[PDB]
Amino acid sequence: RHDREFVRTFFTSPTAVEDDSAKMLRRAAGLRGMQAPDVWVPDNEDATAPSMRDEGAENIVEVISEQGAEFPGEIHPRMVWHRDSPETRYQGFQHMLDITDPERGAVEHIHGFVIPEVGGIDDWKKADEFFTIVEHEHGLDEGSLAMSVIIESGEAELAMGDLRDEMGKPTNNLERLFLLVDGEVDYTKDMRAMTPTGELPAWPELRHNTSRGASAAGCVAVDGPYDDIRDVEGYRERMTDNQAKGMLGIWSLTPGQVVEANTSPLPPKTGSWLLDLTADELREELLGLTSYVPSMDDIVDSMEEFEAAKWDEATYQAAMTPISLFQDVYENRPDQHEELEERYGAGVVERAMEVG
Amino acid sequence: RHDREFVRTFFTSPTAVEDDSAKMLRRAAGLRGMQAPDVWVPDNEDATAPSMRDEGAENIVEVISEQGAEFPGEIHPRMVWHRDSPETRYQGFQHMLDITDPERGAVEHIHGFVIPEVGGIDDWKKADEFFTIVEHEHGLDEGSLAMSVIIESGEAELAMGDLRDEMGKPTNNLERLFLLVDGEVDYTKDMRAMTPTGELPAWPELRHNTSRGASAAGCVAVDGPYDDIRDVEGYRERMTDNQAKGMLGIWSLTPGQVVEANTSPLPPKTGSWLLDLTADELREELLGLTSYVPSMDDIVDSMEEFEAAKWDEATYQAAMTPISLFQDVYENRPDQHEELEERYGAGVVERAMEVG
Amino acid sequence: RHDREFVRTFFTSPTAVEDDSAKMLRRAAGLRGMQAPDVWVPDNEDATAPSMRDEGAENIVEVISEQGAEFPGEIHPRMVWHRDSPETRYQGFQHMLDITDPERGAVEHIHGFVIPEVGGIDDWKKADEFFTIVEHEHGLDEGSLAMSVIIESGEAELAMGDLRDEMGKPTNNLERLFLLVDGEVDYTKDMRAMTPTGELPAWPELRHNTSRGASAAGCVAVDGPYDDIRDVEGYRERMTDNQAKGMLGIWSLTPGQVVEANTSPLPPKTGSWLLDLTADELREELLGLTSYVPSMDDIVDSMEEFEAAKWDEATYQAAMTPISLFQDVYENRPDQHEELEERYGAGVVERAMEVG
Amino acid sequence: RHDREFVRTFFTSPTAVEDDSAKMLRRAAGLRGMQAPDVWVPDNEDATAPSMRDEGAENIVEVISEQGAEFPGEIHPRMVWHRDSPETRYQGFQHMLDITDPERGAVEHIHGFVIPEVGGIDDWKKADEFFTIVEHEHGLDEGSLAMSVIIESGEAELAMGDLRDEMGKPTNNLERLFLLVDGEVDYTKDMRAMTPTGELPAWPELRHNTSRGASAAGCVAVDGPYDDIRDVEGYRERMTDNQAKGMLGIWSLTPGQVVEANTSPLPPKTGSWLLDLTADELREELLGLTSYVPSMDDIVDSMEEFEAAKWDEATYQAAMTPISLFQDVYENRPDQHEELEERYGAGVVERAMEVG
Amino acid sequence: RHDREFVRTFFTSPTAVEDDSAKMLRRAAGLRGMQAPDVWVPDNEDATAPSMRDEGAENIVEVISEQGAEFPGEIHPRMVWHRDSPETRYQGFQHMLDITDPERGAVEHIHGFVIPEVGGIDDWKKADEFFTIVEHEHGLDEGSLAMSVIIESGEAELAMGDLRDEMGKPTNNLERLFLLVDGEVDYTKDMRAMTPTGELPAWPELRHNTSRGASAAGCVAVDGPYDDIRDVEGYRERMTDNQAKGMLGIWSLTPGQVVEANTSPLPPKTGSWLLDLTADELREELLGLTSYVPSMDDIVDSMEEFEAAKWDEATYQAAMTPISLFQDVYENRPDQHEELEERYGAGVVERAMEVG
Ligand SMILES: [Cl-]
Ligand SMILES: [Cl-]
Ligand SMILES: [Cl-]
Ligand SMILES: [Cl-]
Ligand SMILES: [Cl-]
Ligand SMILES: [Cl-]
Ligand SMILES: [Cl-]
Ligand SMILES: [Cl-]
Ligand SMILES: [Cl-]
Ligand SMILES: [Cl-]
Ligand SMILES: [Cl-]
Ligand SMILES: [Cl-]
Ligand SMILES: [Cl-]
Ligand SMILES: [Cl-]
Ligand SMILES: [Cl-]
Ligand SMILES: [Cl-]
Ligand SMILES: [K+]
Ligand SMILES: [K+]
Ligand SMILES: [K+]
Ligand SMILES: [K+]
Ligand SMILES: [K+]
Ligand SMILES: [K+]
Ligand SMILES: [K+]
Ligand SMILES: [K+]
Ligand SMILES: [K+]
Ligand SMILES: [K+]
Ligand SMILES: [K+]
Ligand SMILES: [K+]
Ligand SMILES: [K+]
Ligand SMILES: [K+]
Ligand SMILES: [K+]
Ligand code: NA
Ligand code: NA
Ligand code: NA
Ligand code: NA
Ligand code: NA
Ligand SMILES: [Pb+2]
Ligand SMILES: [Pb+2]
Ligand SMILES: [Pb+2]
Ligand SMILES: [Pb+2]
Ligand SMILES: [Pb+2]
Ligand SMILES: [Pb+2]
Ligand SMILES: [Pb+2]
Ligand SMILES: [Pb+2]
Ligand SMILES: [Pb+2]
Ligand SMILES: [Pb+2]
Ligand SMILES: [Pb+2]
Ligand SMILES: [Pb+2]
Ligand SMILES: [Pb+2]
Ligand SMILES: [Pb+2]
Ligand SMILES: [Pb+2]
Ligand SMILES: [Pb+2]
Ligand SMILES: [Pb+2]
Ligand SMILES: [Pb+2]
Ligand SMILES: [Pb+2]
Ligand SMILES: [Pb+2]
């Protein structure tokens, strides 16, 4: 259905940083060769602060208009969307309409849009309908804008199961679907999962399911952000694990990740047989080798700080899980207040209840 | 939809032990603090012998009437049910009707009921309809009794996929759904699985799927019984694995498990950094460290014993898998009788065929 | 629904080898005891060269007519089929019709047929309808031919979810379904997966899902080919892993595998407790212990060879994945041609583009 | 699926009249020959006053036990049921359970039960489940009690469309379905229809749809009560119209209707060619020829009377339609009170508002 | 989807009359102008005796090869098919395959095929799959053969409701659907309807429903055979009634009907205002004005005759309805044998029971 049968790299850039707010886009747009992504995603949702998103959409039109023709990969900006926020949906749609105004010269270099936070199949149809309306409002060919989604809810994971048959209904244009991209960060929160370090679970079933959804429906599966940018070995191992599920693309957050991800699924240059101090302040190998499990006090410290500063929003949300749980317990189990105060001291308890 | 946004512990108690048959309930009802469950489940199904289940339902009304007001958690007794037994369904429904007679004073302290052995979504609706009828027979608010299910069949696992949309149909009241609880013990038998030791498979996909079903439908996911009560470390590791799937509650079988499970998902009191004889008859550390793989002779010994005594019923059923398989082979492969007798000796063979 | 409640072994034989083309069948038909499969599958699809498949179907009728009565297991030949090839479907159906001509004496010893490469549930119905027509064309009892399928697509994996309810519709006879068999080889290609060595991924979710589909629908789950015939230990470990998912049967490719698979799910003869040079050119233990990761040059060498000879077809297809990917990249990323030539040298590049 | 391929007559009898309350049943049970129905329906729902329905169910067991063996047609008593009343459902189920106690000797002469007021297909399943439970509670063969439904809601009319496929699901026993019977009286009220005289609309589409539902699903279609017992010509014309839709059975309310309905679909005794005072107080031919359109005053008179006496309940409900409408208008259109009082006088208005 | 946006006339011809069996086809093929149909249907099903249908399919290839190029309308032969006969389905498919052999020169003048007696939507898919296989077996363009169906069952009428969404599924090619044609003759029997004269009911709902199905799915609605060929006025009135439902085409059985039907939906040549012996043996105006209602004796006479001669088969089937009903009554109501013998005399009764 789409020109790229495989996509190796899916690279996001912030659209407006709060200087030239568009600086990140103009540089990403100059990337070439192995450093340039099969798919580049100017990112008007999680990569860009919310107060900056209207300037972000302006910057997307400015840059793609100016540099879009020369970009060697395909361009699919990510808009705002949420299955549970009609205001967010309408926002994304308004931005899409602006960005594709043919008089501004960007649309002709835009292959499609990425829609995050989608829900059940009826939510996907609402995004599709916006695509169709944008196309008709600006005289584009029907179906010419590809839609890609980020799978970051239980709901969306289940929705991939019924796609082949829903896609063929005549009341939608969902043949425009292109990529199915996992969003482990938000999926973790939607699932209310938690780990001692805050590292993301690996969610091998999700990735299996997205790979399968993609092959059943004629889409392309892509894995989510691997945000420990220094862990080049870990990134490679994830990509290899993914390739064994038939998920041959991955999200990249830097141009070095892009190079690594562009190279990983290609056959090696030479064969190999497998069988059954030292520097100085380069002992930051130990930062690589360590991880920290925070206490209640730490998490509450951190949150209090982040709330006053209002750790990015996703870190804050991840912490909110165990804290929301602590607070549900405290509200509903008066019989446990004594063991809890004794467990954490009352300083912390009452502070944990103020957080959120 | 329900008051408890999180549930950490789901603790079952037998309802009639064959002295005061209700003794286990009266003590469980006195538990407080960290030893008391978020959800307490007086258990009229697998925890209670079948000849005792009618006295069990009487005991549930006596105890909850007498001690129910003071119980710090929520009370959700488990009734009998089976997707393939209309008599069992009707039994559970009769017990539910008795237990909730408002003149007996228990119902006002009962938040809902737990229904085991459910099947496809149409079986869930049959349980729901019984709830609705009980509510109307006794003037309770419609939807005031929460329903929780145990997922212990392939059928039920698949049914979670279609819940969001089935729940909204006007011919049911399935918005009453609260917990989705895995039942690994019976699920193992429904799946006809088997292990060399008889240890339960870990069934990570089931737990993933139940976690996902819960987040898609507004329910709460809970894992099943960890019956090796001495293996406190194993219990903790399972809980941690679960938390990484977004399954933050677990079944508890003793008040010590309850303490462990009540504490596990709470943040630690202090931080930690991670990196890449001796006693005497306390060498029962070796019982902890060992496991035994039985032979055909052992299993048939055991079964013959258990059948004469008629190892609990679930152990017997687990054994029945390889034995049923041995017997299917023997009935259908006369060409294999010689290698089989030679394999086990004829003593055993003919005994294996009498078992069942 | 079917006579065999359990099936341990599913053993395929080529139907026409290009001497007596039927030689493999006549020998397989003589197997007895532990060396003989619960289910024997004369294989007219992947085990038999395509130019030989019409003689294959003749050989199936000759041998089963001659030796079929004495065969101790059940006989279910595999026909050609493909969800995306109407010509292949019609071929399989024509062969089935010939094979079951009651005047040729084979049908009375044939329990059913195996259908590979099935897709969504509507494709399964197309196979079912062919069964029904064959039955009526030859006066067989309706439903007397069992249908077994090979699950080797994402589509088919998803289709198992809706089977219980689709099976009961009156417009089909899908109660004839017997085995659900995983086909990891082709499933790997349908999923576009790849591994460094070319070893098959383990696909634990697929096997979980097929086991679950089987228990939900009254079918029997069977795992796919373990083609490293020398790795007897690996075969045993896979069977044990499978048994823990409730997949108690497995495909066997030699009579020794048949013995191993016939023995594996039976209880051991004696108990066991578990706890927490040397020869000469027998150093082929090292062939067992090694594996090779090929380079681009190797893969392209190999393919060029195989294409000229036109490594079996499935190996060729597995290689086609990374090469198809390399070629999609080359066609769409002119900006990457320099780093690619430098990576592999231009000899290889232009050769990689000729392959396919 | 059922013994009677055609059913001509469906004759209801009250079960307890408030003397021998069972008198009507004992006589109906003696009917023979053309005066006896293909299907006799001891009627514990609309034919029997609600305060009498528990004695009604007792009378059904007494009479059928005593006279049931000799009855020449099939016996299918009608139980209470309502799609919107869980208490009514449970009542019907309790009565069914009592009536079929095999120790009372009625069940062996009962072919099935008639369930009125059914809704969407999920409500039909709730009735089916009660049947299945009754069968298992009393050791009857599964599926031996036929279920017949009365179609008297929009919901039920739509439900016939999806029956063939819902009937085959393994979670129900709806193959027990036998008759689909129109209930024009209640259907009229469910549809909120009204006529100037109070005569029932003819509802030709309903009858078409029920006929079609019956042929699509292997059931038998039957039309509803023709309560103008003296209008023998009208009854014949309705039966002829019905026969032209493939609805070959009809409800009968007297033994004379039974004779007429038993005779109508049989071929005439001789052929016929078609082409393009007088007595005295026998001028009650004029009662036959007239009908009366009541005024608001009449209807309110009547209702006030009926409410004080608390015209049967169905007449009262039919009147409630225009009156409910008048009252919705009065509550919501204060701007219309003057034209309304002038239209009816205020005597009536304020009385019309007290009615209901 | 298809070239003809409207179809006025759908004219059937027998394919082999038992002289030149193909005589009827060769003449129909010469029709031109107003006497020639928009759609001509060489009819290998009900118009042709069953013993003649294999020569019929040969004749279709001979004539269309010889005269097909010059035919001014579109050619869509009707094949045999039945929802409940796998042998009939396979027959139709075999004939379709022969007829479209491109080496015989007919296919290039064949626009599609007409499939009668279709059932639920899954039966329509079975016909579609045969089309797809025929296309691929002979190198035709996929979808180039239009499929038209005859709606002559309750099942098929209900199936039109779900067509838009089923048509878009990727496992079928049902976008090939062209005409939806009512078959009142067989639909009458499927519905088990009956009239005093044997005239067909008008079935206005069916026609409404088929018209609606056609507009919902992008198909064209056509009414069924009006077999009283002399009643030119009646034919016109039916066509006008149809046009008011949006069913603008009708079946034609003679070239005069073709002229009438070709002219009816065209605007009149001049305007008109509407407002609120005589010959000799031309008194066959009375045959036009009369109709005969047969007795039991007549019908049984007739059937006995027709059975010995074995009134066409459809007349015989129509009679079978009341007779099947009489026989169900006689088998099940021994209490009615006396009134029945008295009603018809025993001569007739026992004869009525031998018929069938
Ligand atoms: Cl919303
Ligand atoms: Cl959603
Ligand atoms: Cl993919
Ligand atoms: Cl059941
Ligand atoms: Cl079930
Ligand atoms: Cl949860
Ligand atoms: Cl295809
Ligand atoms: Cl498919
Ligand atoms: Cl899944
Ligand atoms: Cl299985
Ligand atoms: Cl209700
Ligand atoms: Cl309803
Ligand atoms: Cl009928
Ligand atoms: Cl059939
Ligand atoms: Cl059908
Ligand atoms: Cl039309
Ligand atoms: K579409
Ligand atoms: K569309
Ligand atoms: K994939
Ligand atoms: K609901
Ligand atoms: K409800
Ligand atoms: K969860
Ligand atoms: K079926
Ligand atoms: K069938
Ligand atoms: K299984
Ligand atoms: K059923
Ligand atoms: K059933
Ligand atoms: K209405
Ligand atoms: K009918
Ligand atoms: K299609
Ligand atoms: K298609
Ligand atoms: Na490019
Ligand atoms: Na509490
Ligand atoms: Na055997
Ligand atoms: Na009888
Ligand atoms: Na033409
Ligand atoms: Pb939501
Ligand atoms: Pb997001
Ligand atoms: Pb695929
Ligand atoms: Pb602090
Ligand atoms: Pb079951
Ligand atoms: Pb259980
Ligand atoms: Pb969610
Ligand atoms: Pb022993
Ligand atoms: Pb496909
Ligand atoms: Pb294959
Ligand atoms: Pb099961
Ligand atoms: Pb080379
Ligand atoms: Pb309602
Ligand atoms: Pb009613
Ligand atoms: Pb039918
Ligand atoms: Pb008055
Ligand atoms: Pb049928
Ligand atoms: Pb026909
Ligand atoms: Pb339309
Ligand atoms: Pb005669």
Side-chain angles (χ1 to χ4, degrees), chain B residues 281-298:
Chain B
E281 203 196 332
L282 259 157
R283 90 303 178 254
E284 281 192 342
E285 200 97 68
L286 262 39
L287 285 191
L289 263 77
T290 51
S291 44
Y292 184 66
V293 177
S295 80
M296 175 84 278
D297 201 24
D298 298 335

mmCIF file of all heavy atoms in Angstrom, chain B residues 281-298:
data_model
loop_
_atom_site.group_PDB
_atom_site.id
_atom_site.type_symbol
_atom_site.label_atom_id
_atom_site.label_comp_id
_atom_site.label_asym_id
_atom_site.label_seq_id
_atom_site.Cartn_x
_atom_site.Cartn_y
_atom_site.Cartn_z
ATOM 1 N N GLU B 281 18.999 -29.042 62.039
ATOM 2 C CA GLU B 281 17.859 -29.571 61.249
ATOM 3 C C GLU B 281 17.166 -28.415 60.507
ATOM 4 O O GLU B 281 16.083 -28.584 59.960
ATOM 5 C CB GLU B 281 16.835 -30.313 62.122
ATOM 6 C CG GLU B 281 15.981 -31.322 61.352
ATOM 7 C CD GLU B 281 14.732 -31.783 62.101
ATOM 8 O OE1 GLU B 281 14.737 -31.795 63.353
ATOM 9 O OE2 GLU B 281 13.736 -32.147 61.429
ATOM 10 N N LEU B 282 17.799 -27.240 60.519
ATOM 11 C CA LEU B 282 17.468 -26.125 59.625
ATOM 12 C C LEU B 282 18.026 -26.360 58.198
ATOM 13 O O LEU B 282 17.914 -25.470 57.337
ATOM 14 C CB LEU B 282 17.987 -24.779 60.201
ATOM 15 C CG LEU B 282 17.019 -23.812 60.931
ATOM 16 C CD1 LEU B 282 17.769 -22.877 61.896
ATOM 17 C CD2 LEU B 282 16.164 -23.024 59.930
ATOM 18 N N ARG B 283 18.628 -27.535 57.950
ATOM 19 C CA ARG B 283 18.988 -27.957 56.585
ATOM 20 C C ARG B 283 17.749 -28.328 55.730
ATOM 21 O O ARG B 283 17.905 -28.770 54.602
ATOM 22 C CB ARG B 283 20.041 -29.090 56.591
ATOM 23 C CG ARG B 283 19.482 -30.518 56.605
ATOM 24 C CD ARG B 283 18.558 -30.752 57.793
ATOM 25 N NE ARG B 283 17.951 -32.091 57.858
ATOM 26 C CZ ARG B 283 16.677 -32.381 57.589
ATOM 27 N NH1 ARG B 283 15.816 -31.440 57.187
ATOM 28 N NH2 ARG B 283 16.259 -33.638 57.723
ATOM 29 N N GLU B 284 16.533 -28.155 56.267
ATOM 30 C CA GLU B 284 15.311 -27.998 55.453
ATOM 31 C C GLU B 284 15.363 -26.819 54.449
ATOM 32 O O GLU B 284 14.469 -26.647 53.629
ATOM 33 C CB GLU B 284 14.086 -27.844 56.355
ATOM 34 C CG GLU B 284 13.582 -29.165 56.932
ATOM 35 C CD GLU B 284 12.205 -29.054 57.584
ATOM 36 O OE1 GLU B 284 11.782 -27.917 57.898
ATOM 37 O OE2 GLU B 284 11.548 -30.101 57.797
ATOM 38 N N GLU B 285 16.394 -25.994 54.523
ATOM 39 C CA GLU B 285 16.831 -25.217 53.372
ATOM 40 C C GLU B 285 16.962 -26.094 52.108
ATOM 41 O O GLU B 285 16.851 -25.601 51.006
ATOM 42 C CB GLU B 285 18.195 -24.613 53.678
ATOM 43 C CG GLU B 285 18.586 -23.429 52.830
ATOM 44 C CD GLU B 285 18.306 -22.100 53.521
ATOM 45 O OE1 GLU B 285 18.974 -21.774 54.535
ATOM 46 O OE2 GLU B 285 17.410 -21.372 53.041
ATOM 47 N N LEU B 286 17.239 -27.383 52.289
ATOM 48 C CA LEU B 286 17.361 -28.354 51.192
ATOM 49 C C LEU B 286 16.011 -28.812 50.623
ATOM 50 O O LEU B 286 15.902 -29.144 49.442
ATOM 51 C CB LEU B 286 18.126 -29.602 51.651
ATOM 52 C CG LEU B 286 19.612 -29.695 51.315
ATOM 53 C CD1 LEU B 286 20.329 -28.362 51.454
ATOM 54 C CD2 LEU B 286 20.209 -30.781 52.199
ATOM 55 N N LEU B 287 15.007 -28.881 51.475
ATOM 56 C CA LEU B 287 13.671 -29.077 51.003
ATOM 57 C C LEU B 287 13.298 -27.885 50.111
ATOM 58 O O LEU B 287 12.788 -28.063 49.014
ATOM 59 C CB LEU B 287 12.715 -29.273 52.175
ATOM 60 C CG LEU B 287 12.812 -30.656 52.842
ATOM 61 C CD1 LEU B 287 11.653 -30.914 53.831
ATOM 62 C CD2 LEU B 287 12.914 -31.771 51.789
ATOM 63 N N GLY B 288 13.634 -26.685 50.556
ATOM 64 C CA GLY B 288 13.456 -25.500 49.745
ATOM 65 C C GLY B 288 14.198 -25.570 48.429
ATOM 66 O O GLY B 288 13.675 -25.122 47.400
ATOM 67 N N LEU B 289 15.406 -26.136 48.455
ATOM 68 C CA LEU B 289 16.264 -26.197 47.263
ATOM 69 C C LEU B 289 16.048 -27.374 46.323
ATOM 70 O O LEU B 289 16.662 -27.450 45.241
ATOM 71 C CB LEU B 289 17.750 -26.131 47.641
ATOM 72 C CG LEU B 289 18.328 -24.712 47.518
ATOM 73 C CD1 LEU B 289 17.887 -23.878 48.712
ATOM 74 C CD2 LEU B 289 19.852 -24.690 47.380
ATOM 75 N N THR B 290 15.259 -28.328 46.738
ATOM 76 C CA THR B 290 15.055 -29.499 45.917
ATOM 77 C C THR B 290 13.654 -29.520 45.313
ATOM 78 O O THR B 290 12.724 -28.840 45.772
ATOM 79 C CB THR B 290 15.185 -30.778 46.744
ATOM 80 O OG1 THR B 290 14.362 -30.675 47.906
ATOM 81 C CG2 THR B 290 16.593 -30.972 47.134
ATOM 82 N N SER B 291 13.514 -30.346 44.301
ATOM 83 C CA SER B 291 12.208 -30.698 43.836
ATOM 84 C C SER B 291 12.320 -32.090 43.282
ATOM 85 O O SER B 291 13.405 -32.516 42.903
ATOM 86 C CB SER B 291 11.707 -29.665 42.819
ATOM 87 O OG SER B 291 12.707 -29.316 41.894
ATOM 88 N N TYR B 292 11.201 -32.797 43.269
ATOM 89 C CA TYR B 292 11.123 -34.176 42.833
ATOM 90 C C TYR B 292 10.273 -34.386 41.554
ATOM 91 O O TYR B 292 9.114 -33.983 41.491
ATOM 92 C CB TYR B 292 10.474 -34.989 43.929
ATOM 93 C CG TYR B 292 10.412 -36.475 43.671
ATOM 94 C CD1 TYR B 292 11.579 -37.232 43.609
ATOM 95 C CD2 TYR B 292 9.199 -37.127 43.528
ATOM 96 C CE1 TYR B 292 11.536 -38.598 43.400
ATOM 97 C CE2 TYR B 292 9.143 -38.496 43.301
ATOM 98 C CZ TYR B 292 10.326 -39.227 43.243
ATOM 99 O OH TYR B 292 10.316 -40.592 42.991
ATOM 100 N N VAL B 293 10.832 -35.089 40.580
ATOM 101 C CA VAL B 293 10.156 -35.479 39.372
ATOM 102 C C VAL B 293 9.662 -36.902 39.531
ATOM 103 O O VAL B 293 10.480 -37.841 39.472
ATOM 104 C CB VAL B 293 11.133 -35.393 38.173
ATOM 105 C CG1 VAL B 293 10.474 -35.871 36.880
ATOM 106 C CG2 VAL B 293 11.656 -33.976 38.001
ATOM 107 N N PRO B 294 8.343 -37.103 39.718
ATOM 108 C CA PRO B 294 7.845 -38.481 39.845
ATOM 109 C C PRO B 294 7.824 -39.379 38.583
ATOM 110 O O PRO B 294 7.833 -38.917 37.440
ATOM 111 C CB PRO B 294 6.438 -38.310 40.418
ATOM 112 C CG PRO B 294 6.009 -36.940 39.979
ATOM 113 C CD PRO B 294 7.267 -36.114 39.912
ATOM 114 N N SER B 295 7.853 -40.684 38.829
ATOM 115 C CA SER B 295 7.784 -41.679 37.822
ATOM 116 C C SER B 295 6.323 -42.011 37.630
ATOM 117 O O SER B 295 5.497 -41.677 38.443
ATOM 118 C CB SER B 295 8.513 -42.966 38.325
ATOM 119 O OG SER B 295 7.646 -43.699 39.191
ATOM 120 N N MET B 296 6.050 -42.768 36.580
ATOM 121 C CA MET B 296 4.748 -43.363 36.333
ATOM 122 C C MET B 296 4.272 -44.125 37.579
ATOM 123 O O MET B 296 3.149 -43.905 38.091
ATOM 124 C CB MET B 296 4.897 -44.272 35.120
ATOM 125 C CG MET B 296 3.711 -45.106 34.706
ATOM 126 S SD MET B 296 2.483 -44.275 33.654
ATOM 127 C CE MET B 296 1.655 -43.461 34.988
ATOM 128 N N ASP B 297 5.155 -44.955 38.138
ATOM 129 C CA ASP B 297 4.796 -45.749 39.330
ATOM 130 C C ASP B 297 4.358 -44.846 40.471
ATOM 131 O O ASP B 297 3.240 -44.974 41.006
ATOM 132 C CB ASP B 297 6.003 -46.609 39.733
ATOM 133 C CG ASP B 297 5.625 -47.802 40.589
ATOM 134 O OD1 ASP B 297 4.448 -48.255 40.527
ATOM 135 O OD2 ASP B 297 6.517 -48.297 41.325
ATOM 136 N N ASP B 298 5.198 -43.878 40.821
ATOM 137 C CA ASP B 298 4.780 -42.870 41.801
ATOM 138 C C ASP B 298 3.409 -42.294 41.512
ATOM 139 O O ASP B 298 2.529 -42.320 42.341
ATOM 140 C CB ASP B 298 5.740 -41.708 41.840
ATOM 141 C CG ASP B 298 7.128 -42.108 42.269
ATOM 142 O OD1 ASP B 298 7.260 -43.138 42.983
ATOM 143 O OD2 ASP B 298 8.075 -41.377 41.880
#
